[PDB]
PDB file of C-alpha atoms in Angstrom:
ATOM      1  CA  UNK A   5       0.000   0.000   0.000  1.00 33.41           C
ATOM      2  CA  UNK A   6       2.345   2.722   1.237  1.00 34.23           C
ATOM      3  CA  UNK A   7       5.215   3.580  -1.096  1.00 33.57           C
ATOM      4  CA  UNK A   8       7.343   6.302   0.507  1.00 29.24           C
ATOM      5  CA  UNK A   9      10.437   4.077   0.298  1.00 28.40           C
ATOM      6  CA  UNK A  10      10.528   4.816  -3.450  1.00 28.23           C
ATOM      7  CA  UNK A  11      10.756   8.553  -2.753  1.00 28.90           C
ATOM      8  CA  UNK A  12      13.426   7.531  -0.224  1.00 29.68           C
ATOM      9  CA  UNK A  13      15.246   5.895  -3.168  1.00 26.23           C
ATOM     10  CA  UNK A  14      14.413   8.596  -5.759  1.00 26.17           C
ATOM     11  CA  UNK A  15      15.290  11.887  -4.046  1.00 26.91           C
ATOM     12  CA  UNK A  16      18.094  10.292  -2.008  1.00 25.96           C
ATOM     13  CA  UNK A  17      19.639   8.923  -5.231  1.00 24.44           C
ATOM     14  CA  UNK A  18      19.340  12.121  -7.310  1.00 28.94           C
ATOM     15  CA  UNK A  32      22.181  25.162  -5.255  1.00 30.23           C
ATOM     16  CA  UNK A  33      18.503  25.574  -6.156  1.00 28.14           C
ATOM     17  CA  UNK A  34      15.407  23.985  -4.611  1.00 30.40           C
ATOM     18  CA  UNK A  35      13.988  22.561  -7.858  1.00 31.35           C
ATOM     19  CA  UNK A  36      14.588  19.063  -6.429  1.00 29.53           C
ATOM     20  CA  UNK A  37      13.376  19.480  -2.830  1.00 30.12           C
ATOM     21  CA  UNK A  38       9.963  20.564  -4.110  1.00 31.70           C
ATOM     22  CA  UNK A  39      10.041  17.423  -6.269  1.00 34.03           C
ATOM     23  CA  UNK A  40      10.542  15.394  -3.079  1.00 36.14           C
ATOM     24  CA  UNK A  41       7.676  17.278  -1.426  1.00 38.72           C
ATOM     25  CA  UNK A  42       5.471  16.345  -4.393  1.00 38.16           C
ATOM     26  CA  UNK A  43       6.675  12.726  -4.228  1.00 42.09           C
ATOM     27  CA  UNK A  44       5.646  12.555  -0.566  1.00 41.57           C
ATOM     28  CA  UNK A  45       2.342  14.412  -1.059  1.00 44.01           C
ATOM     29  CA  UNK A  46       1.363  12.113  -3.950  1.00 42.07           C
ATOM     30  CA  UNK A  47       0.675   9.574  -1.179  1.00 40.51           C
ATOM     31  CA  UNK A  48      -0.665  12.023   1.438  1.00 38.29           C
ATOM     32  CA  UNK A  49      -3.236   9.519   2.743  1.00 33.95           C
ATOM     33  CA  UNK A  50      -2.013   5.919   2.386  1.00 34.07           C
ATOM     34  CA  UNK A  51       0.999   6.268   4.717  1.00 33.52           C
ATOM     35  CA  UNK A  52      -0.860   7.690   7.752  1.00 31.73           C
ATOM     36  CA  UNK A  53       0.801   5.445  10.322  1.00 28.79           C
ATOM     37  CA  UNK A  54       4.222   4.634   8.875  1.00 27.44           C
ATOM     38  CA  UNK A  55       6.891   6.407  10.920  1.00 26.99           C
ATOM     39  CA  UNK A  56       9.040   6.953   7.820  1.00 26.42           C
ATOM     40  CA  UNK A  57       6.279   8.939   6.083  1.00 29.12           C
ATOM     41  CA  UNK A  58       5.919  11.540   8.850  1.00 30.58           C
ATOM     42  CA  UNK A  59       9.713  11.521   9.253  1.00 30.07           C
ATOM     43  CA  UNK A  60      10.214  12.330   5.556  1.00 33.55           C
ATOM     44  CA  UNK A  61       7.536  15.048   5.612  1.00 30.10           C
ATOM     45  CA  UNK A  62       9.120  16.749   8.624  1.00 27.97           C
ATOM     46  CA  UNK A  63      12.600  16.366   7.119  1.00 28.51           C
ATOM     47  CA  UNK A  64      11.452  18.037   3.904  1.00 23.76           C
ATOM     48  CA  UNK A  65      10.015  20.817   6.075  1.00 22.75           C
ATOM     49  CA  UNK A  66      13.384  21.146   7.839  1.00 21.59           C
ATOM     50  CA  UNK A  67      15.391  21.246   4.605  1.00 20.32           C
ATOM     51  CA  UNK A  68      12.912  23.797   3.205  1.00 20.18           C
ATOM     52  CA  UNK A  69      13.945  26.373   5.840  1.00 18.60           C
ATOM     53  CA  UNK A  70      17.684  25.594   5.635  1.00 18.39           C
ATOM     54  CA  UNK A  71      18.873  26.381   2.085  1.00 21.26           C
ATOM     55  CA  UNK A  72      16.555  29.422   1.735  1.00 23.50           C
ATOM     56  CA  UNK A  73      13.887  28.233  -0.722  1.00 23.35           C
ATOM     57  CA  UNK A  74      11.900  31.473  -1.131  1.00 21.97           C
TER      58      UNK A  74
ATOM     59  CA  UNK B  13      36.229   7.063  25.121  1.00 21.93           C
ATOM     60  CA  UNK B  14      34.128   4.607  27.156  1.00 20.55           C
ATOM     61  CA  UNK B  15      32.747   1.159  26.386  1.00 19.71           C
ATOM     62  CA  UNK B  16      29.690   0.654  24.204  1.00 18.79           C
ATOM     63  CA  UNK B  17      26.864   1.619  26.543  1.00 21.05           C
ATOM     64  CA  UNK B  18      23.291   2.874  26.660  1.00 22.21           C
ATOM     65  CA  UNK B  19      22.624   6.571  27.184  1.00 23.74           C
ATOM     66  CA  UNK B  20      19.588   8.771  27.640  1.00 26.71           C
ATOM     67  CA  UNK B  21      17.717   9.885  24.534  1.00 22.94           C
ATOM     68  CA  UNK B  22      14.449  11.776  25.048  1.00 23.77           C
ATOM     69  CA  UNK B  23      11.966  11.718  22.161  1.00 22.24           C
ATOM     70  CA  UNK B  24       9.529  14.648  21.997  1.00 23.93           C
ATOM     71  CA  UNK B  25       6.881  14.236  19.284  1.00 21.37           C
ATOM     72  CA  UNK B  26       5.806  17.882  19.539  1.00 20.78           C
ATOM     73  CA  UNK B  27       9.314  18.921  18.457  1.00 24.35           C
ATOM     74  CA  UNK B  28       8.934  16.800  15.313  1.00 25.42           C
ATOM     75  CA  UNK B  29       5.587  18.239  14.252  1.00 27.13           C
ATOM     76  CA  UNK B  30       3.976  14.833  14.819  1.00 27.27           C
ATOM     77  CA  UNK B  31       1.447  16.540  17.085  1.00 23.77           C
ATOM     78  CA  UNK B  32      -0.766  16.709  13.974  1.00 20.70           C
ATOM     79  CA  UNK B  33      -1.469  12.951  14.144  1.00 20.46           C
ATOM     80  CA  UNK B  34      -0.206  11.430  17.438  1.00 22.45           C
ATOM     81  CA  UNK B  35      -2.619  11.643  20.358  1.00 26.86           C
ATOM     82  CA  UNK B  36      -0.690  10.020  23.208  1.00 29.07           C
ATOM     83  CA  UNK B  37       1.997   9.766  24.334  1.00 31.08           C
ATOM     84  CA  UNK B  38       3.676  13.037  23.416  1.00 31.84           C
ATOM     85  CA  UNK B  39       7.184  12.074  24.602  1.00 31.06           C
ATOM     86  CA  UNK B  40       9.110   9.050  25.852  1.00 29.64           C
ATOM     87  CA  UNK B  41      12.562   7.797  26.843  1.00 30.22           C
ATOM     88  CA  UNK B  42      14.161   5.961  23.902  1.00 31.08           C
ATOM     89  CA  UNK B  43      17.869   5.839  24.793  1.00 30.68           C
ATOM     90  CA  UNK B  44      20.676   5.455  22.280  1.00 30.92           C
ATOM     91  CA  UNK B  45      23.881   3.471  21.964  1.00 34.27           C
ATOM     92  CA  UNK B  46      27.370   4.947  21.996  1.00 35.58           C
ATOM     93  CA  UNK B  47      30.859   3.708  22.790  1.00 35.82           C
ATOM     94  CA  UNK B  48      33.981   1.983  21.553  1.00 36.69           C
ATOM     95  CA  UNK B  49      33.792  -1.582  20.211  1.00 36.94           C
ATOM     96  CA  UNK B  50      37.352  -2.834  20.600  1.00 35.24           C
ATOM     97  CA  UNK B  51      38.890  -6.167  21.540  1.00 37.83           C
ATOM     98  CA  UNK B  52      37.918  -7.884  23.725  1.00 37.51           C
ATOM     99  CA  UNK B  53      34.126  -7.676  23.892  1.00 37.45           C
ATOM    100  CA  UNK B  54      32.273  -7.766  27.215  1.00 38.70           C
ATOM    101  CA  UNK B  55      29.805 -10.453  28.295  1.00 39.97           C
ATOM    102  CA  UNK B  56      26.806  -8.097  28.377  1.00 41.79           C
ATOM    103  CA  UNK B  57      27.492  -7.120  24.755  1.00 38.44           C
ATOM    104  CA  UNK B  58      26.654 -10.784  23.756  1.00 41.18           C
ATOM    105  CA  UNK B  59      27.601 -10.236  20.113  1.00 39.42           C
ATOM    106  CA  UNK B  60      27.410 -12.159  16.852  1.00 38.47           C
ATOM    107  CA  UNK B  61      30.122 -14.547  15.686  1.00 34.86           C
ATOM    108  CA  UNK B  62      30.786 -12.131  12.824  1.00 31.89           C
ATOM    109  CA  UNK B  63      31.024  -9.266  15.319  1.00 32.22           C
ATOM    110  CA  UNK B  64      33.600 -11.246  17.321  1.00 30.20           C
ATOM    111  CA  UNK B  65      35.667 -12.060  14.246  1.00 30.87           C
ATOM    112  CA  UNK B  66      35.569  -8.500  12.857  1.00 30.59           C
ATOM    113  CA  UNK B  67      36.580  -7.073  16.225  1.00 29.02           C
ATOM    114  CA  UNK B  68      39.477  -9.501  16.524  1.00 28.98           C
ATOM    115  CA  UNK B  69      40.644  -8.690  12.992  1.00 31.03           C
ATOM    116  CA  UNK B  70      40.394  -4.954  13.646  1.00 27.05           C
ATOM    117  CA  UNK B  71      42.559  -5.546  16.716  1.00 25.15           C
ATOM    118  CA  UNK B  72      45.118  -7.458  14.635  1.00 26.29           C
ATOM    119  CA  UNK B  73      45.315  -4.898  11.800  1.00 25.24           C
ATOM    120  CA  UNK B  74      43.107  -1.778  11.980  1.00 25.80           C
ATOM    121  CA  UNK B  75      44.095  -0.883   8.405  1.00 23.24           C
ATOM    122  CA  UNK B  76      42.583  -4.042   6.886  1.00 21.52           C
ATOM    123  CA  UNK B  77      39.511  -4.305   9.134  1.00 22.29           C
ATOM    124  CA  UNK B  78      37.392  -1.517  10.643  1.00 25.65           C
ATOM    125  CA  UNK B  79      35.865  -1.951  14.109  1.00 26.07           C
ATOM    126  CA  UNK B  80      32.277  -3.002  14.697  1.00 25.76           C
ATOM    127  CA  UNK B  81      29.696  -0.444  15.844  1.00 22.66           C
ATOM    128  CA  UNK B  82      27.726   0.211  19.022  1.00 26.70           C
ATOM    129  CA  UNK B  83      24.046  -0.396  18.228  1.00 25.85           C
ATOM    130  CA  UNK B  84      20.831  -1.543  19.918  1.00 27.79           C
ATOM    131  CA  UNK B  85      20.673  -5.309  20.319  1.00 28.81           C
ATOM    132  CA  UNK B  86      17.418  -5.546  22.315  1.00 28.95           C
ATOM    133  CA  UNK B  87      14.456  -3.193  22.058  1.00 29.54           C
ATOM    134  CA  UNK B  88      11.049  -2.889  23.644  1.00 28.11           C
ATOM    135  CA  UNK B  89       7.817  -1.575  22.085  1.00 28.39           C
ATOM    136  CA  UNK B  90       5.588   1.311  23.000  1.00 25.69           C
ATOM    137  CA  UNK B  91       1.891   1.776  22.362  1.00 28.37           C
ATOM    138  CA  UNK B  92       0.852   4.911  20.468  1.00 29.29           C
ATOM    139  CA  UNK B  93      -2.670   6.265  19.974  1.00 26.15           C
ATOM    140  CA  UNK B  94      -3.170   8.128  16.697  1.00 27.99           C
ATOM    141  CA  UNK B  95      -5.609   9.037  13.924  1.00 28.09           C
ATOM    142  CA  UNK B  96      -4.867   7.281  10.644  1.00 28.97           C
ATOM    143  CA  UNK B  97      -6.028   7.949   7.087  1.00 27.74           C
ATOM    144  CA  UNK B  98      -9.686   6.938   7.484  1.00 28.08           C
ATOM    145  CA  UNK B  99     -10.166   9.286  10.494  1.00 24.94           C
ATOM    146  CA  UNK B 100     -10.048   6.306  12.874  1.00 24.54           C
ATOM    147  CA  UNK B 101      -8.392   6.326  16.295  1.00 25.63           C
ATOM    148  CA  UNK B 102      -5.901   3.455  16.579  1.00 25.37           C
ATOM    149  CA  UNK B 103      -4.048   2.052  19.601  1.00 22.97           C
ATOM    150  CA  UNK B 104      -1.022   0.338  18.044  1.00 20.85           C
ATOM    151  CA  UNK B 105       1.980  -1.384  19.598  1.00 21.44           C
ATOM    152  CA  UNK B 106       4.960  -0.080  17.616  1.00 22.82           C
ATOM    153  CA  UNK B 107       7.967  -2.370  17.972  1.00 23.72           C
ATOM    154  CA  UNK B 108      11.661  -1.500  18.378  1.00 22.01           C
ATOM    155  CA  UNK B 109      11.016   1.830  20.084  1.00 18.36           C
ATOM    156  CA  UNK B 110      13.010   1.730  23.366  1.00 21.20           C
ATOM    157  CA  UNK B 111      16.654   0.598  23.368  1.00 19.39           C
ATOM    158  CA  UNK B 112      17.098  -1.948  26.153  1.00 17.28           C
ATOM    159  CA  UNK B 113      20.629  -3.199  25.574  1.00 14.90           C
ATOM    160  CA  UNK B 114      23.540  -2.141  23.415  1.00 14.21           C
ATOM    161  CA  UNK B 115      26.152  -4.325  21.793  1.00 15.07           C
ATOM    162  CA  UNK B 116      28.705  -4.541  19.011  1.00 15.12           C
ATOM    163  CA  UNK B 117      27.706  -5.731  15.534  1.00 11.72           C
TER     164      UNK B 117
ATOM    165  CA  UNK C  13      31.414   9.168   1.984  1.00  9.72           C
ATOM    166  CA  UNK C  14      28.967   6.671   0.445  1.00  7.99           C
ATOM    167  CA  UNK C  15      25.752   5.112   1.717  1.00  7.92           C
ATOM    168  CA  UNK C  16      25.743   2.278   4.232  1.00  8.14           C
ATOM    169  CA  UNK C  17      26.723  -0.698   2.095  1.00  7.97           C
ATOM    170  CA  UNK C  18      28.276  -4.152   2.198  1.00  9.50           C
ATOM    171  CA  UNK C  19      31.948  -4.576   1.346  1.00  9.41           C
ATOM    172  CA  UNK C  20      34.356  -7.459   0.958  1.00  9.77           C
ATOM    173  CA  UNK C  21      35.937  -8.890   4.097  1.00  8.36           C
ATOM    174  CA  UNK C  22      38.055 -12.033   3.707  1.00  8.47           C
ATOM    175  CA  UNK C  23      38.507 -14.187   6.816  1.00  8.57           C
ATOM    176  CA  UNK C  24      41.647 -16.352   6.903  1.00 10.23           C
ATOM    177  CA  UNK C  25      41.746 -18.715   9.894  1.00 11.62           C
ATOM    178  CA  UNK C  26      45.430 -19.519   9.355  1.00 13.96           C
ATOM    179  CA  UNK C  27      46.251 -15.843   9.964  1.00 12.18           C
ATOM    180  CA  UNK C  28      44.495 -16.048  13.341  1.00 11.32           C
ATOM    181  CA  UNK C  29      46.328 -19.137  14.568  1.00  9.93           C
ATOM    182  CA  UNK C  30      43.043 -21.064  14.534  1.00 12.21           C
ATOM    183  CA  UNK C  31      44.737 -23.679  12.359  1.00 14.84           C
ATOM    184  CA  UNK C  32      45.413 -25.524  15.638  1.00 14.46           C
ATOM    185  CA  UNK C  33      41.735 -26.536  15.946  1.00 14.35           C
ATOM    186  CA  UNK C  34      39.787 -25.761  12.726  1.00 15.15           C
ATOM    187  CA  UNK C  35      39.927 -28.451  10.054  1.00 11.31           C
ATOM    188  CA  UNK C  36      37.862 -26.976   7.219  1.00 11.07           C
ATOM    189  CA  UNK C  37      37.256 -24.455   5.866  1.00 12.58           C
ATOM    190  CA  UNK C  38      40.438 -22.433   6.254  1.00 11.74           C
ATOM    191  CA  UNK C  39      39.049 -19.161   4.837  1.00 13.59           C
ATOM    192  CA  UNK C  40      35.754 -17.627   3.736  1.00 14.39           C
ATOM    193  CA  UNK C  41      34.104 -14.413   2.549  1.00 12.16           C
ATOM    194  CA  UNK C  42      32.432 -12.657   5.498  1.00 10.32           C
ATOM    195  CA  UNK C  43      31.888  -9.088   4.262  1.00 11.13           C
ATOM    196  CA  UNK C  44      31.504  -6.065   6.511  1.00  9.84           C
ATOM    197  CA  UNK C  45      29.280  -3.012   6.720  1.00 14.46           C
ATOM    198  CA  UNK C  46      30.425   0.558   6.183  1.00 17.68           C
ATOM    199  CA  UNK C  47      28.804   3.832   5.185  1.00 19.18           C
ATOM    200  CA  UNK C  48      26.936   6.922   6.286  1.00 21.23           C
ATOM    201  CA  UNK C  49      23.554   6.597   8.016  1.00 18.53           C
ATOM    202  CA  UNK C  50      21.954   9.984   7.415  1.00 16.21           C
ATOM    203  CA  UNK C  51      18.419  11.142   6.692  1.00 13.01           C
ATOM    204  CA  UNK C  52      16.588   9.807   4.812  1.00 10.41           C
ATOM    205  CA  UNK C  53      17.120   6.047   5.000  1.00 12.19           C
ATOM    206  CA  UNK C  54      16.867   3.845   1.907  1.00 12.66           C
ATOM    207  CA  UNK C  55      14.320   1.069   1.374  1.00 16.63           C
ATOM    208  CA  UNK C  56      16.917  -1.725   1.336  1.00 18.88           C
ATOM    209  CA  UNK C  57      18.183  -0.576   4.745  1.00 22.21           C
ATOM    210  CA  UNK C  58      14.727  -1.589   6.212  1.00 24.85           C
ATOM    211  CA  UNK C  59      15.546  -0.214   9.663  1.00 25.05           C
ATOM    212  CA  UNK C  60      13.981  -0.203  13.115  1.00 22.23           C
ATOM    213  CA  UNK C  61      11.486   2.421  14.257  1.00 23.14           C
ATOM    214  CA  UNK C  62      14.104   3.580  16.762  1.00 24.82           C
ATOM    215  CA  UNK C  63      16.674   3.773  13.961  1.00 25.73           C
ATOM    216  CA  UNK C  64      14.281   5.952  11.939  1.00 28.17           C
ATOM    217  CA  UNK C  65      13.593   8.268  14.864  1.00 26.58           C
ATOM    218  CA  UNK C  66      17.267   8.604  15.863  1.00 28.74           C
ATOM    219  CA  UNK C  67      18.257   9.356  12.276  1.00 26.63           C
ATOM    220  CA  UNK C  68      15.560  12.002  11.956  1.00 24.36           C
ATOM    221  CA  UNK C  69      16.608  13.604  15.246  1.00 21.65           C
ATOM    222  CA  UNK C  70      20.268  13.581  14.220  1.00 20.74           C
ATOM    223  CA  UNK C  71      19.182  15.348  11.033  1.00 21.89           C
ATOM    224  CA  UNK C  72      17.263  17.957  13.044  1.00 19.17           C
ATOM    225  CA  UNK C  73      20.063  18.662  15.552  1.00 18.95           C
ATOM    226  CA  UNK C  74      23.336  16.702  15.256  1.00 16.36           C
ATOM    227  CA  UNK C  75      24.489  18.138  18.597  1.00 15.52           C
ATOM    228  CA  UNK C  76      21.645  16.554  20.591  1.00 14.08           C
ATOM    229  CA  UNK C  77      21.439  13.245  18.700  1.00 13.44           C
ATOM    230  CA  UNK C  78      24.242  11.203  17.117  1.00 10.80           C
ATOM    231  CA  UNK C  79      23.607   9.281  13.887  1.00  7.00           C
ATOM    232  CA  UNK C  80      22.830   5.579  13.775  1.00  8.81           C
ATOM    233  CA  UNK C  81      25.484   3.101  12.619  1.00  6.73           C
ATOM    234  CA  UNK C  82      25.995   0.857   9.601  1.00  4.17           C
ATOM    235  CA  UNK C  83      25.804  -2.752  10.817  1.00  6.36           C
ATOM    236  CA  UNK C  84      24.790  -6.211   9.588  1.00  8.28           C
ATOM    237  CA  UNK C  85      21.032  -6.710   9.614  1.00  8.90           C
ATOM    238  CA  UNK C  86      20.893 -10.170   7.987  1.00  6.87           C
ATOM    239  CA  UNK C  87      23.517 -12.891   8.281  1.00  9.70           C
ATOM    240  CA  UNK C  88      23.968 -16.414   7.018  1.00 12.10           C
ATOM    241  CA  UNK C  89      25.716 -19.344   8.739  1.00 12.78           C
ATOM    242  CA  UNK C  90      28.686 -21.423   7.742  1.00 10.20           C
ATOM    243  CA  UNK C  91      29.543 -24.981   8.690  1.00 12.28           C
ATOM    244  CA  UNK C  92      32.931 -25.558  10.328  1.00  7.38           C
ATOM    245  CA  UNK C  93      34.640 -28.886  11.020  1.00  7.55           C
ATOM    246  CA  UNK C  94      36.856 -28.880  14.110  1.00  9.57           C
ATOM    247  CA  UNK C  95      38.251 -30.926  16.996  1.00  9.09           C
ATOM    248  CA  UNK C  96      36.770 -29.975  20.357  1.00  8.01           C
ATOM    249  CA  UNK C  97      37.890 -30.688  23.918  1.00  6.20           C
ATOM    250  CA  UNK C  98      37.178 -34.437  23.998  1.00  6.21           C
ATOM    251  CA  UNK C  99      39.249 -35.051  20.815  1.00  7.66           C
ATOM    252  CA  UNK C 100      36.049 -35.428  18.770  1.00 10.73           C
ATOM    253  CA  UNK C 101      35.581 -34.155  15.220  1.00  8.51           C
ATOM    254  CA  UNK C 102      32.483 -31.945  15.002  1.00 13.61           C
ATOM    255  CA  UNK C 103      30.626 -30.546  11.981  1.00 13.65           C
ATOM    256  CA  UNK C 104      28.809 -27.516  13.406  1.00 16.72           C
ATOM    257  CA  UNK C 105      26.678 -24.844  11.757  1.00 17.44           C
ATOM    258  CA  UNK C 106      27.899 -21.574  13.281  1.00 17.16           C
ATOM    259  CA  UNK C 107      25.323 -18.815  12.878  1.00 20.76           C
ATOM    260  CA  UNK C 108      25.811 -15.129  12.016  1.00 17.27           C
ATOM    261  CA  UNK C 109      29.001 -15.688  10.032  1.00 18.13           C
ATOM    262  CA  UNK C 110      28.396 -14.075   6.600  1.00 18.61           C
ATOM    263  CA  UNK C 111      26.945 -10.554   6.358  1.00 15.95           C
ATOM    264  CA  UNK C 112      24.106 -10.617   3.835  1.00 15.94           C
ATOM    265  CA  UNK C 113      22.606  -7.154   4.192  1.00 14.77           C
ATOM    266  CA  UNK C 114      23.606  -3.952   5.924  1.00 15.79           C
ATOM    267  CA  UNK C 115      21.367  -1.362   7.506  1.00 17.77           C
ATOM    268  CA  UNK C 116      21.199   1.451  10.028  1.00 19.18           C
ATOM    269  CA  UNK C 117      20.454   0.743  13.695  1.00 17.85           C
TER     270      UNK C 117
ATOM    271  CA  UNK D   5      30.172 -24.580  31.190  1.00 18.16           C
ATOM    272  CA  UNK D   6      32.535 -22.174  29.439  1.00 17.61           C
ATOM    273  CA  UNK D   7      33.358 -19.010  31.370  1.00 16.03           C
ATOM    274  CA  UNK D   8      35.704 -16.859  29.279  1.00 15.95           C
ATOM    275  CA  UNK D   9      33.242 -13.946  29.419  1.00 13.01           C
ATOM    276  CA  UNK D  10      34.337 -13.393  33.038  1.00 13.84           C
ATOM    277  CA  UNK D  11      37.951 -12.945  31.922  1.00 14.26           C
ATOM    278  CA  UNK D  12      36.447 -10.654  29.266  1.00 14.45           C
ATOM    279  CA  UNK D  13      34.954  -8.661  32.174  1.00 15.22           C
ATOM    280  CA  UNK D  14      37.962  -8.993  34.529  1.00 15.93           C
ATOM    281  CA  UNK D  15      40.974  -8.048  32.391  1.00 15.27           C
ATOM    282  CA  UNK D  16      38.939  -5.616  30.270  1.00 14.41           C
ATOM    283  CA  UNK D  17      37.762  -3.845  33.452  1.00 14.97           C
ATOM    284  CA  UNK D  18      41.165  -3.664  35.193  1.00 14.16           C
ATOM    285  CA  UNK D  32      53.628  -0.036  31.470  1.00 13.99           C
ATOM    286  CA  UNK D  33      54.458  -3.550  32.681  1.00 13.31           C
ATOM    287  CA  UNK D  34      53.009  -6.911  31.631  1.00 12.67           C
ATOM    288  CA  UNK D  35      52.048  -8.080  35.138  1.00 10.59           C
ATOM    289  CA  UNK D  36      48.385  -7.917  34.043  1.00 10.73           C
ATOM    290  CA  UNK D  37      48.551  -9.474  30.558  1.00 11.46           C
ATOM    291  CA  UNK D  38      50.059 -12.632  32.046  1.00  8.76           C
ATOM    292  CA  UNK D  39      47.154 -12.570  34.513  1.00  8.99           C
ATOM    293  CA  UNK D  40      44.782 -12.579  31.527  1.00  6.55           C
ATOM    294  CA  UNK D  41      46.743 -15.448  29.972  1.00  3.95           C
ATOM    295  CA  UNK D  42      46.311 -17.387  33.227  1.00  3.32           C
ATOM    296  CA  UNK D  43      42.600 -16.499  33.335  1.00  2.00           C
ATOM    297  CA  UNK D  44      42.160 -17.928  29.833  1.00  3.02           C
ATOM    298  CA  UNK D  45      44.347 -21.002  30.448  1.00  5.97           C
ATOM    299  CA  UNK D  46      42.444 -21.842  33.653  1.00  7.91           C
ATOM    300  CA  UNK D  47      39.716 -23.025  31.255  1.00  8.29           C
ATOM    301  CA  UNK D  48      42.004 -24.441  28.535  1.00  6.81           C
ATOM    302  CA  UNK D  49      39.624 -27.329  27.769  1.00 11.20           C
ATOM    303  CA  UNK D  50      35.982 -26.363  28.390  1.00 13.00           C
ATOM    304  CA  UNK D  51      35.825 -23.603  25.747  1.00 14.45           C
ATOM    305  CA  UNK D  52      37.101 -25.660  22.776  1.00 17.36           C
ATOM    306  CA  UNK D  53      34.472 -24.469  20.312  1.00 14.47           C
ATOM    307  CA  UNK D  54      33.503 -20.988  21.492  1.00 14.72           C
ATOM    308  CA  UNK D  55      34.817 -18.423  19.012  1.00 14.61           C
ATOM    309  CA  UNK D  56      35.471 -15.915  21.806  1.00 13.79           C
ATOM    310  CA  UNK D  57      37.861 -18.306  23.584  1.00 11.19           C
ATOM    311  CA  UNK D  58      40.197 -18.756  20.601  1.00 12.42           C
ATOM    312  CA  UNK D  59      39.796 -15.041  19.829  1.00  7.02           C
ATOM    313  CA  UNK D  60      40.919 -14.080  23.349  1.00  4.97           C
ATOM    314  CA  UNK D  61      43.848 -16.525  23.265  1.00  5.29           C
ATOM    315  CA  UNK D  62      45.092 -15.146  19.945  1.00  4.95           C
ATOM    316  CA  UNK D  63      44.548 -11.565  21.130  1.00  4.16           C
ATOM    317  CA  UNK D  64      46.626 -12.222  24.244  1.00  5.00           C
ATOM    318  CA  UNK D  65      49.295 -13.660  21.938  1.00  5.29           C
ATOM    319  CA  UNK D  66      49.143 -10.486  19.823  1.00  7.41           C
ATOM    320  CA  UNK D  67      49.381  -8.140  22.813  1.00  9.66           C
ATOM    321  CA  UNK D  68      52.272 -10.243  24.168  1.00 10.34           C
ATOM    322  CA  UNK D  69      54.470  -9.300  21.180  1.00 11.65           C
ATOM    323  CA  UNK D  70      53.382  -5.635  21.097  1.00 11.12           C
ATOM    324  CA  UNK D  71      54.407  -4.010  24.405  1.00  9.37           C
ATOM    325  CA  UNK D  72      57.663  -6.029  24.653  1.00 10.52           C
ATOM    326  CA  UNK D  73      56.969  -8.501  27.476  1.00 16.30           C
ATOM    327  CA  UNK D  74      60.400 -10.169  27.729  1.00 19.45           C
TER     328      UNK D  74
END
């Protein structure tokens, strides 16, 4: 059912934030199925952290 | 520079923004493992045959073999109450949540 | 500075003076684990809930939480033939001898 | 039966080699029971290694 481990193998395997927003979209494409998996909420919060670190507008 | 041992690690779900889905608890003691894994290994570490062999080889020649690492070898669960996808409240026993012993692997 | 992965580790029993009791084999491929365990963790690492949480916390603040470690998460056995105490030849399946996957713990 | 893990908690918890010979005696006090345990042969060979490292006569 849940498939956040593909985003964990897609973003993690790939100066601007044109890629971090791609990871945010990868995680939000399954914004319902992974309500329970620790790795889903961990990846969402980590994307939030990296969003306010490299200054992404 | 002390032996592989268990240390305090406090987990606060509010700090991680998981307040938006976790009901209770909001924080717990999880512990973490930290310390040197050099030869010889202690009884309470109770390691794997591979861990023993790699440690011994690292002792013989540290250039050809790197030391093993200090990691959790026994864990306990905790029970979390949350709201899943279908807007249902769930009491679930999540496993491997509290480090209970450390060892070399 | 690469991901937590499995690497070659050759084990030679003659080098360890265990020729005095091991009959066969005299050497085997054991592998070892080595690599960075940073956020996020890969699918093939398949880690523990605690490992996930500790990695995420290390990512948030590396001063308050140290990263997890790259260790063997699945091992296979090998069968060794030796002479024990009572001068008896024994074919024994020793467990956790060959690293088969690495992960973060 | 085997009890080398006590020597692994006695020597490991304690300029001269008056202590390494004590570890050798601790391991040789059970020079028969632990014929099979990997840790026994590992400790014997490690004592041999440390014997020819700090120059113990």
